[PDB]
């Protein structure tokens, strides 16, 4: 299990938690030196448990599917909450079996539903380590609108920071003050699947992408990734999604 404690978290310890998280996921191969996430796992072993403590030391356990880094739901002392989606219902079979109550959130765990539910698009929700602490605290007592907002912060500061070193760096910049995510990071978040596929499709095409992944990222708008020498490949993306899951 990976843990993090916001109390006395500087940028180093976050980075260290994020390295752990990355490290708890299994992969067999590395494609172009990036870990290729297994195409599937079976059992409770498909699920990684994150223990997250806020500043007062209250904790939620979050459950992450290790095949795609997808947050399934979590446990707040005796209650578990899962998303309203099939994978999340399957997960419920293997995790938090000892909770005294199981609530299904009114929404699935994808961004479009979570933003709708929360009233703000991702671009207008501050993220940082102070936000995450807030987010943890919200989650500790049920409010389905407040949770949509915290879950949006929660996904971005754990799962998306695992996937991309850039985003893990943004959050380090925000260890003591929150700030809305950059276009660059909304773009990276959305393109993980596209990127993942093309990096794999480039083995046996000479590191060349069959289709070029255009990021807004940091060319202000409209960058285009076309082969694997690009920095988003060489230095940014940290975890690959298996093409069996795309
Ligand atoms: N509940 C969740 N937990 C982790 N990641 C996601 C995502 C991510 O949004 C992007 C797909 O368009 C991709 O990174 C998918 O992994 N949406 N919801 C998520």
Curated annotation (Swiss-Prot):
Report the GO molecular function annotations.
rRNA N-glycosylase activity; toxin activity
Enzyme Commission identifier(s): 3.2.2.22
User: Would you list which residues are glycosylated?
Assistant: 227
Catalytic activity from the UniProt record:
Endohydrolysis of the N-glycosidic bond at one specific adenosine on the 28S rRNA
Q: InterPro entries in the record, alphabetically?
A: Ribosome-inact_prot_sf (IPR036041), Ribosome_inactivat_1/2 (IPR017989), Ribosome_inactivat_prot (IPR001574), Ribosome_inactivat_prot_CS (IPR017988), Ribosome_inactivat_prot_sub1 (IPR016138), Ribosome_inactivat_prot_sub2 (IPR016139)
Keywords from the named record: Glycoprotein, Hydrolase, Plant defense, Protein synthesis inhibitor, Signal, Toxin
| An individual GO BP term | negative regulation of translation
The answer to keyword Transmembrane helix applying to this record is no
Q: Which family does it belong to?
A: Belongs to the ribosome-inactivating protein family. Type 1 RIP subfamily.
**This chain belongs to which protein, by name?**
Ribosome-inactivating protein momordin I
């Amino acid at each position: 299990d990976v843990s993090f404690r916001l109390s006395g978290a500087d940028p180093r310890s976050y980075g260290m938690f994020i390295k752990d998280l990355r490290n708890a996921l299994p992969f067999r191969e590395k494609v172009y030196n990036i870990p290729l996430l297994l195409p599937s796992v079976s059992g409770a072993g498909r699920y990684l448990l994150m223990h997250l403590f806020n500043r007062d030391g209250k904790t939620i356990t979050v459950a992450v599917d290790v095949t795609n880094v997808y947050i399934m739901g979590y446990l707040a002392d005796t209650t578990s909450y899962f998303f309203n989606e099939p994978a999340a219902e399957l997960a419920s079979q293997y995790v938090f079996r000892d909770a005294r109550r199981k609530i299904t959130l009114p929404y699935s765990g994808d961004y479009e539903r979570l933003q709708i539910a929360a009233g703000k698009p991702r671009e207008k929700i501050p993220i940082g380590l102070p936000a995450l602490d807030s987010a943890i605290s919200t989650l500790l007592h049920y409010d389905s609108t407040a949770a949509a907002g915290a879950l949006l912060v929660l996904i971005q500061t754990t799962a998306e920071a695992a996937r991309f070193k850039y985003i893990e760096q943004q959050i380090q910049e925000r260890a003591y003050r929150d700030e809305v995510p950059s276009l660059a990071t909304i773009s990276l978040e959305n393109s993980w699947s596209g990127l993942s596929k093309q990096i794999q499709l480039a083995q046996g095409n000479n590191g060349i992408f069959r289709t070029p992944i255009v990021l807004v990222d940091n060319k202000g708008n409209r960058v285009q990734i076309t082969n694997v020498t690009s920095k988003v490949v060489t230095s940014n993306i940290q975890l690959l999604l298996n093409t069996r899951n795309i």
